[PDB]
Amino acid sequence: GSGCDDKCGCAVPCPGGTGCRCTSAR
Ligand SMILES: [Cd+2]
Ligand SMILES: [Cd+2]
Structure with a gap:
């Protein structure tokens, strides 16, 4: 999860979750 x-x-x-920069990288 x-x-x-x-x-x-x-x-x-x-x-x-989504708003955080957690997934702005790759
Ligand atoms: Cd994180
Ligand atoms: Cd985070």
Whole structure:
């Protein structure tokens, strides 16, 4: 499902999902 990690390069307790820059990279 969803649930970020610090390994991503952004905070773990995310603001939600899609709006975050979590997927603006490739
Ligand atoms: Cd995030
Ligand atoms: Cd993330």
